[PDB]
Each structure stands twice: as C-alpha cells, then as structure tokens.
C-alpha cells in the first residue's frame, strides 16, 4: 500500500503499473478525489486558474525575451520587405559544420530559427520599435505571473479562501467580466492605440517617460466634453503615407475609413482605435443589467462545455477574419506566417469544439438529474434524441454519398481524356453574397453593386462613409478579401459541411446516449469513461460516452485537414499569381493529390539529399518524424490489450529466470496498457502525428517559394 496517487486512494492499493498511469490521468480531475467537498472543490479550481494564468504570462515573456535577446527586431523594423523574423538562436551540440552554415540564416552569425508566429508583426503595430522595448515587456510579464502565482496561494489560505456562495454567484460574475474585463480593458486598449500605437506609426516615439507630455491630438479632450467629437476625424494618413514615419502622416485618432492601408495591406490603426472604443461602450452598458439556471449554476461541466463552445466558435472567428482582414502590418506579405496562423487557430478551434460536446457529455452522466430536470429545454432534447441523431445520420450520409460521388465522377471523367464533361457547380449562392458585399467582378448588380440601393445610399442621415474604403478593397484583386471562388470551391465546402455534420453526429451521439440505450440501459451507473460491458449482448466495444469523444477526434482532424488543405492550396495560387492551378485541378481528386501533396512537397523532401542539406532539413526531419509517430498510434488503435498482457506474462518469465538480472526486481508488476488507456495513447500519437506532419509540410512548402 503506497501513497501515490494522493488523489485516488483506491489507486494506491493497485500493485501494478496501472497505478502509475492512472495516477497521471486521474490527476487534475478534482471531482474524483477522495474526501473532496464542493466547498473545497471550487477553491482548487480557482487557484489552478491562477497557475494557468501565470503560464500564459511566462510563455509570452519568453517570446518577448528571445526576440529581444536572440532576434532581429530592430533590423526588421527598418525593412520588413526583405528581412525574415528570427524566433530564437539555435544551440544544439549535435549539429555539424555544414549545418551551422545552413542555419545561420537571415544574415545572422549564429544558428537561428526563422519565426513563423508573426509576433514581430503583432508587436510592430502595438508600437514597439526597439529591442529594449520588448525586454521591458518580458520583465513586466514576469511580475504579472508572480502576481498570479502569489494570488493562487493566497486564495487557499484560511483567511483568504473565497466562500462557496462567492463561487456560485454568477449574477455578479457577468456584470464584472463584461463590464471590467471586457469593457474597460477594451477601453484601456483604446488608450494604447491613440496614445502610443498611432503616433508610433507616424514617426513619433511615445514611451512611458514622455507620454504624459505629448498628447494624442492637437486639440486633446477639449471637444470631448462639449460634444464636438467630429474633430478627431480630421486629415488622416493618406495613400502617400508609409508606415512608421512622418512622410505625409495625419493627426486623426478615431476614424472609420474602412479598407486597408495602401502599402502594408493592413488595417488603419485609427480604425482599430475607433473599433475597441465602441466595443467598450457596448460592453460597459451590457454590464449594468444584473429550473434551468439551477442546473447551469450547479453543474461545473455545463459551464465548461459552454465555455469551450464559446471559445471554439470565436477561435474559428479569429482565423477566418485575420487572413482576409489583416489586422497587422506586413502580415499579409509574410505568406508562411499567415498560413501558419490560420492553421494554428483552426486546429485549436476543432479541439475546443470537440471538448465542448465532451464536457457536456460528462455533465449528463455526473451532474444531470432527470427527476429534477423535467419539461425544460434540456429534458426535451433528451426526449427526442433519436430524432436528432437520425436526422444527423442523414445529412452526414446525404453529403458524403454525393460530394464523394461528385469527386469520383470528376476523377473518372478527367482520367478518360475528357475534362470537358465534369459536373462543375458554380457556387452562385456565395457569389451572390460577395456581390451583396460589393464584389462587382461577377455582375449580379443588386445590394452594394447596386449603386442606387438604399443600403449604399443610406437616405436617412447621409451615413455611408466607410463604403468608399471597403469597395476599393473587395473589388481589387491584390488581397484575400472575399476571394474569387469557382466550382472547385463548391466541392470542398460540402466536404467541410460533411465534416462539421459528422463530427457533431458522433459527439451528440455519445452526449445524448450517455445515460442509457437498449444495449446498456444503465450507462450512467458505469461513468463517463469505461471500456465496455463485456462480450455479452453482442459485444459492447467502444460503447461509452468517452469513446464517442474518441472517434470524433479523428473526424475533427480530418475536417480541419479538409479545411486547411483548401486554405493552403487556394492561397498557393493566389500568392504565386497562378490562380488557374486551383481552378482546374481542384475539381477532381487527383489534382488535389498530384498538384498539392506531390508537387509542393518536393522542396521540403530535398531538405537533406546525399549532396547537401538546407534550412528545411529540420522540417524534412519533422515531416518524417510526424509520419513515424502517427503510424505508432495505429499500434495502440488496431492491436488491443490481451495480446500484450499475454506477451508481458512471458517477458515477466524471461526476466525471472535470467541470471544476473533475476536479482533486480520491479516494485510495480508490469501489465499491459488498459483498454481506455491505449485508446488515448493511440489517439495522442495519431493527433500529434497529424499535426506535426502538416506543420512541417505547410511551413516548408511555402518558405521554399513564397
């Protein structure tokens, strides 16, 4: 009888290696610990959020420091059109001499990593110009993380412990997070843009020492009180004005021109200044307002699923809006970072959206009470749960029968020497919406292509001022604002719609069927995560609500895989000026295979040939490294446990009978990985290998050509 794990004392009596693995897995599951009370529960959640908040602060200080120390931030401000951003310096003893000459890139003397996160682009528009300004930010975030780790320990002391009623009072929680956390901190960020980021974009150095002297406006705050707010909309930065100098700049601070900067292809900072200003006013007035509420407040897993659903929606919202509307200077010109930034947040948004349904499914086993919850919206969705799954079983099967057959049609027909016979459906619905938003390329001629429509004219109060800026961007084919789509873009969006419907189908299958079916009626008596109910009743493998999460992680990786293959290959012809490659080849699945996976992975895969090596050989290594770890998950997925338990029962024998090693004895009896355990182990190697392989391919196929 050992001590570890302290959480589960029933795991401590386990004398096998399962105790070691299940101690790592039942670790941060705080509802499962022995002797826990709900008053003690929420305080451990509260302090763990402080520990997590410091990690985000320590991570950002590391990104600020290693650009300040080992980067080229000052060299990149003077010329962002040729200089590649440096992430950190490389110091590995395993390198050769010909490799240090190949990784001493961006003109540096030491092996450095060319950055693809674009925090250079983010900090350049927040106002920073010098390497010392980034270091002061890294120093400051070490103070905030110290403030986070102190306050987490502080709010576990017996005099500073928050009460249970302080935790379950959500009425004052929403008033303060929309009010203070969302409203004032958007009003505070409005103070950063007008004081600092706007004059730093016009050649004026505004730092902590001199910002009390200089004012953001030549008529500062004297017309804010008499109501004459229109004087902040004076002469702005013209089309002549290059970013970061006084070459034809302006004095306006809150303008609503719309459109992009004519040289950096980014937003005007006066737009972002007036943006977060109005976001602050809406969130401030939204915070002065405060049997289902007894369910959402009681259930910790309910609010976590809704939070991951809210996070997962707004994370896709970032990636969809950041590439078409670039908010950062010279981020549109950095093709590799723009590609890496879309693919970053979309893969996280899939993980957040899968985890939303996952934690709602845990709520239905643990926290849901059908005798208390009756006749509300929740106990009605359970009441016709067969109607929701089967109608999700149709739209999954309706699209997948047809958009596959639409591909196999176009494959077979193109293969037979007759490309002129393909079923090419022009996406007229979305091409209407671009023509509704103003794209006059197609020629639909209603709604903001209609120059005499009431929306473009706005006959009430002569409002339409932001439409001159917007309509010079969507109509011009120099950026990614409302990309020109054709029939190849039709077929992928229905593959995408197949993926979002199928991943929802699996996730709401195990959500609604977490409490029982005709197979296992008592699935709430066995918990959220358990392997099976045996070989009886036909055999019940992967039956649980945990294993319905587990099958949908393959589907989100495939759906984001369909998504980001389409993002990358569409932009690989947009950036290269040859849009016709996605035009003809994307309609059939061989051009998706030959002209994207085969054609673009050539310069990656010559990262190390027998004649030399390049700076892509770290990506060509991590490419193959990602193939190997992905394929290893298959081993835990295909092969199952009792093969290996009868393989260890012979390795236990051969260890107990081998002299000079018979003497060395284990303390944990070696067992095979459990059933639920190697589903996770196989999915982890699958999911890491899915992501590591693309991130090596997406970077090296774009850095070789731009």
């Amino acid at each position: 009888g050992t001590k570890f794990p302290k959480a589960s004392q029933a795991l401590a009596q386990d004398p096998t290696t399962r105790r070691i693995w299940y101690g790592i897995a039942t670790a941060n599951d705080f509802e499962t610990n022995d002797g826990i009370t709900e008053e003690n529960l929420y305080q451990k959640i509260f302090a763990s959020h402080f520990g997590h908040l410091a990690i985000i602060f320590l991570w950002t200080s590391g990104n600020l420091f290693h650009v300040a120390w080992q980067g080229n931030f000052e060299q990149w401000v003077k010329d962002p059109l040729n200089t590649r951003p440096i992430a950190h310096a490389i110091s590995d003893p395993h390198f050769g001499q010909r490799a240090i000459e190949a990784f001493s890139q961006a003109g540096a003397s030491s092996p450095v990593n060319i950055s693809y996160s674009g925090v250079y682009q983010w900090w350049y528009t927040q106002g920073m110009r010098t390497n010392e300004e980034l270091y002061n930010g890294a120093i400051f975030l070490l103070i905030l993380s110290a403030l986070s780790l102190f306050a987490g320990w502080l709010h576990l002391q017996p005099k500073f412990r928050p009460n249970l009623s302080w935790f379950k009072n959500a009425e004052s929680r929403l008033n303060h997070h929309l009010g203070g956390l969302f409203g004032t901190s958007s009003l505070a960020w409005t103070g950063h843009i007008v004081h600092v980021a706007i004059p730093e974009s016009r050649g004026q150095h505004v730092g902590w020492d001199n910002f009390l002297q200089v004012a953001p406006h030549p008529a500062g705050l004297q017309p804010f009180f008499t109501g004459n707010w229109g004087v902040y909309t004076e002469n702005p930065d013209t089309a002549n004005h290059v970013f970061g100098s006084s070459d034809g700049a302006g004095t306006a601070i809150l303008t609503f021109l719309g459109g992009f900067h004519p040289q950096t292809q980014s937003l005007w900072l006066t737009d972002i200044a007036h943006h977060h200003l109005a976001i602050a006013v809406l969130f401030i007035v939204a915070g002065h307002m405060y049997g289902l509420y007894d369910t959402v407040n009681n259930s910790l897993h309910f609010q976590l699923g809704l939070a991951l659903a809210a996070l997962g929606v707004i994370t896709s919202l970032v990636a969809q809006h950041m590439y078409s509307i670039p908010p950062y200077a010279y981020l549109a010109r950095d093709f590799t970072t723009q590609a890496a930034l879309y693919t970053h947040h979309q893969y996280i948004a899939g993980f957040l959206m899968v985890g939303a349904f996952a934690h709602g499914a845990i709520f239905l086993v643990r926290d849901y009470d059908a005798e208390q919850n009756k006749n509300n919206v929740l106990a009605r969705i359970i009441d016709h749960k067969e109607a929701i799954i089967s109608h999700l079983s149709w739209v999954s099967l309706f699209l997948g029968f047809h958009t596959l057959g639409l591909y196999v049609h176009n494959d077979v027909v193109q293969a037979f020497g007759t490309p002129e016979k393909q079923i090419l459906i022009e996406p007229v619905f979305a091409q209407w919406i671009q023509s509704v938003h103003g794209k006059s390329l197609y020629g639909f001629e209603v709604l903001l292509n209609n120059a005499d429509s009431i929306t473009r004219v706005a006959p009430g109060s002569a409002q339409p001022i932001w439409l001159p800026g917007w309509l010079d961007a969507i109509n011009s084919g120099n950026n990614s604002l409302f990309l020109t789509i054709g029939p190849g873009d039709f077929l992928v969006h229905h593959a995408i719609a197949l993926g979002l419907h199928t991943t929802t189908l699996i996730l709401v299958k195990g959500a609604l069927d977490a409490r029982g079916s005709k197979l296992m009626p008592d699935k709430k008596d066995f918990g959220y995560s358990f392997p099976c109910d045996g070989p009886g009743r036909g055999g019940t493998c992967d039956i649980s609500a945990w294993d319905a999460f587990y099958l949908a992680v393959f589907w989100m990786l495939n759906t984001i895989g369909w998504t980001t293959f389409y993002w990358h290959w569409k932009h690989l012809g947009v950036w290269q000026g040859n849009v016709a490659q996605f035009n003809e080849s994307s309609t059939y699945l061989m051009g998706w295979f030959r002209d994207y996976l085969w054609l673009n992975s050539s310069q990656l895969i010559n990262g190390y040939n027998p004649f030399g090596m390049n700076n892509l050989s770290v990506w060509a290594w991590m490419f193959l490294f990602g193939h190997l770890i992905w394929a290893t998950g298959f081993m835990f997925l295909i092969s199952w446990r009792g093969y290996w338990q009868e393989l260890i029962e012979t390795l236990v024998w051969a260890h107990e009978r081998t002299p000079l090693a018979n003497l060395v004895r284990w303390k944990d009896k070696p067992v095979a990985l459990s059933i639920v355990q190697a589903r996770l182990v196989g999915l982890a190697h699958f999911a890491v290998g899915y992501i590591v392989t693309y991130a090596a391919f997406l970077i090296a196929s774009t850095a070789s050509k731009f």
């Binding site: 300040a68 270091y135 890294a138 102190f150 320990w153």
Partner: peptide, 29 residues
C-alpha cells in the same frame, strides 16, 4: 541587448520560481 540585462531577467525570474514552488506545494496539500 546589453549583457547585464540578461542576468537581471534571470534574477527577476526567481520571484515566480519560488512562488510557483510555493503554490504547487500548497495545491498538493
């Protein structure tokens, strides 16, 4: 940068290091 600023940043990083050790030794308790 300057060489003295690196050892200053390593010095101020001890303040979260003791506090992360102090929080985790209280979160374990």
């Amino acid at each position: 940068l300057a060489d003295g600023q690196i050892f200053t940043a390593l010095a101020v990083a001890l303040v979260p290091g003791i506090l992360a050790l102090r929080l985790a030794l209280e979160l374990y308790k």
